[model samples]
Target: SIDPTTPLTYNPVIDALVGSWRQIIDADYSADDTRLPDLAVLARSTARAVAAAVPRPLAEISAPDAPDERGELVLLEKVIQEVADREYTPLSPEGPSVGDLVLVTEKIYNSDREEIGADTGRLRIIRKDPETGHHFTVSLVTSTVQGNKLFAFGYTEMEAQLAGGRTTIQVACWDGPWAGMSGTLSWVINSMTAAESRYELRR
Candidate 1:
């Protein structure tokens, strides 16, 4: 329910603030990036690994797009057992915790085919969903420091919390690295829970 009375100038900014960031950590890590990642391949790899890893408690998950590998399955079994043994669970009782809020003086940069530059500002982790395939979201705000020009910008990205899920994923916003002003972000993770579990994507 967007507030129609709200100004459009505040739309992207507000969306960034209230948006839920997410990334699918790929179990199939590859160095190549020429082609779009095959969902089947991605699914299978993720299945082989995550199925073995077992996300701790509540029903079994199967990956339909994965290849048959007895060894990987064994490894997955061990991983799943570990997850269950640890009894790793997410809190759904109250609202989301302030999750991972990071305020630091760091340099951020983006080097796409269109632009290449850097910015220094703060970052925050509003959410962390390890059970949902180790996924989480981050907010980035920084200032551009160039030769004689200086400007500030804000960017919030929802990425696959793990490195494995980011091989060929491309964001379709104003491009990942850009310059601008301050903004806010928000999201919902209750859908990631069981009964209404969101784990089917990897399966």
Candidate 2:
């Protein structure tokens, strides 16, 4: 028998979301030349509540054509803003509803502390019926200042449950490269676990 009201035992999905935001926040924190006060506010805010928080006001950020890698930074900054505007809760036995965001991360371990591969992405719930399942889509493009990039897009079916006194989530991807076949695999895996404790047993 499992309870329906408690938090999930492990929520890799929301963990990914927090990881994604952490990257942008970290960059903002370490920046000395382009220090932005608003970035710090948004970063500090999310550190308190669930994985989501109000973001600093900003419109869509586009990649610039200049020789520098500033475009990727701009794009990521905008994505962070979008991620900050949403609220994330642990998987509920009642299940996620339509329009909810579902984050997922799969990592291939080489050792207790090392990973050989990783996959991280987000799904936007388009339809969900607890009795049946959930339907959602995901598009993720990630990269680094060194020119590494990963692109993943897919549709997924998921089911949420409460077992052993914690939430459990099962997902099946119907399409695309979201299972550890991207250049950003290492980054994805590392980031996912970087903030793992953030989602710990918050009931």
Candidate 3:
């Protein structure tokens, strides 16, 4: 059941990256609390924190070298859990499934790296394998004003490897705007680290 005329441009690695970034964006911007009064301060502080989190000299992970003429790549993997450190129970027909979509919104920072507005986006699940990982695609569904942005439309793939009861995600892309996009990565890493630290303190 394959289409002969369709182009191929699918990559799981990129999907993972996009999803991870979106997860962080949601964590950073979308919340019930009111906006902070000092946007400039928050912007600078956020920028600093993100900048500090990225590994210096950047151990880069390049996107795939090529995709089919149509720019579509086939994904044969499991879906990565949207939440971290959580157990996956196969309660048929009730839990997450293929084709599910995750919506996210986060604050956008200006070129000065200050808080200014917000952006909205979403990702759709393509397939899942409980024992392995999952595959999904980013619909380039984004709207923003201040924060850095990248890759809203592309077939990305992600695979999760478990270690010490934690899943480390590996993302790959067939093609998109990822080069020179590290600020977003830093923000995601730093924010996740902060959340984990706070959780530990509370416990």
**Steric collisions counted per model:** 24, 2, 28
| TM-score against truth, every candidate | 0.24, 0.27, 0.31
C-alpha local distance difference test of each model? 0.25, 0.29, 0.31
Compose the digit string of candidate 2's lDDT tens values, residues 90-183: 4456655554554544433322334334444454544444444444322232212112222322233333211112221222111122221111
lDDT tens digits, residues 57-123, model 1?
Answer: 3544336885643321100000000000111123445533334333333222222222222322233
TM-score of 2: 0.27
Give lDDT tens digits, candidate 3, residues 121-144.
344444454445554333333332
What TM value does model 1 have?
0.24
Worst 10 residues of 3 by lDDT: 194-203
lDDT comparing candidate 3 with the true structure: 0.31
lDDT accuracy of residue 38 in candidate 1: 48
After best superposition, candidate 1 residue 196: deviation in angstroms? Answer: 37
- Candidate 3's displacement at residue 94, Å, is 4.1
